[PDB]
C-alpha cells in the first residue's frame, strides 16, 4: 500500500538525516560556521545530499532505486505509491553517474560541495561560506587531478550534474510536503522539521 510504503520511506529518511547531520559536523571548516549558517546550509541542501546517497546505492541496479540496502523500488512499485515521476528523475541522475562511473569517494566530496554551494537566503557570513565552498571545490579538483589525470575535465562533468540534482531535490521536497499536508502518512519530527523549513 501507499500508506505503509511512504511511511517506510519517510522513516528511512529520518534515520539517514541523523547520519547526515553527524557527517556534516566533521566536514573540515563546517563547524567553524555560525550555528545559524550551519543550519541554513543543511536546511537548503538536505534533500540534494539524501538523493546523492540514493544514487550511489542504486548504481549496482538496472531501473531500480535503492532507498536503503534492503528497500529497493522498481518502476511498477513506484507508480503504485505515486512516486513514478520522482523515480524517473532520480534514475536520470543514476544514468549519468553510472556512465561516469562515479566513485564512493567522489559522492562524499560532491555531497559536501553541494552543502556549501546550496545558495541559502539567510546566510550571516557570506564570505565564511564562500571560503568553505572554495576549499571543498578544491578538494574535488585535487582528487580528480591525482586519481583521474587522463580524464582532464572530469570534475566539470561531475559539477554539470548539480543543476539536475538541485532541480530533482526541489521536486522531492514539494512531493513529500504534499504528502505531509494530506495527513495520512505519519512522519518523524526531524524529517518534518526539514520538510517544513524556511
Amino acid at each position: 500500500g501507499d500508506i505503509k510504503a511512504l511511511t517506510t520511506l519517510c522513516d528511512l529518511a529520518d534515520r539517514e538525516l541523523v547520519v547526515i547531520i553527524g557527517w556534516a559536523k566533521h566536514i573540515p571548516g563546517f563547524s567553524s560556521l555560525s550555528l545559524g549558517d550551519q543550519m541554513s546550509l543543511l536546511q537548503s541542501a538536505w534533500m540534494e545530499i539524501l538523493i546523492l546517497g540514493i544514487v550511489y546505492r542504486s548504481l549496482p541496479y538496472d531501473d531500480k532505486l535503492v532507498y536503503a540496502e534492503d528497500y529497493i523500488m522498481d518502476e511498477e512499485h513506484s507508480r503504485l505509491a505515486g512516486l513514478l515521476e520522482l523515480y524517473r528523475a532520480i534514475l536520470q541522475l543514476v544514468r549519468r553517474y553510472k556512465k561516469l562511473k562515479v566513485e564512493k569517494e567522489e559522492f562524499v566530496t560532491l555531497k559536501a560541495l553541494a552543502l556549501a554551494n546550496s545558495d541559502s537566503m539567510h546566510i550571516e557570513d557570506l564570505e565564511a561560506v564562500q571560503k568553505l565552498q572554495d576549499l571543498l571545490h578544491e578538494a574535488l579538483q585535487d582528487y580528480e587531478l591525482s586519481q583521474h589525470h587522463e580524464e582532464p575535465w572530469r570534475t566539470g562533468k561531475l559539477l554539470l550534474t548539480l543543476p539536475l540534482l538541485r532541480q530533482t531535490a526541489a521536486k522531492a521536497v514539494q512531493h513529500f510536503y504534499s504528502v505531509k499536508l494530506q495527513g495520512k502518512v505519519p512522519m518523524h519530527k526531524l524529517f518534518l522539521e526539514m520538510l517544513e523549513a524556511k
Partner: peptide, 10 residues
C-alpha cells in the same frame, strides 16, 4: 523551525 536540528548540532 530548527529546534531539533540545533540540538543535534549541539
Amino acid at each position: 523551525k530548527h529546534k531539533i536540528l540545533h540540538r543535534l548540532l549541539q
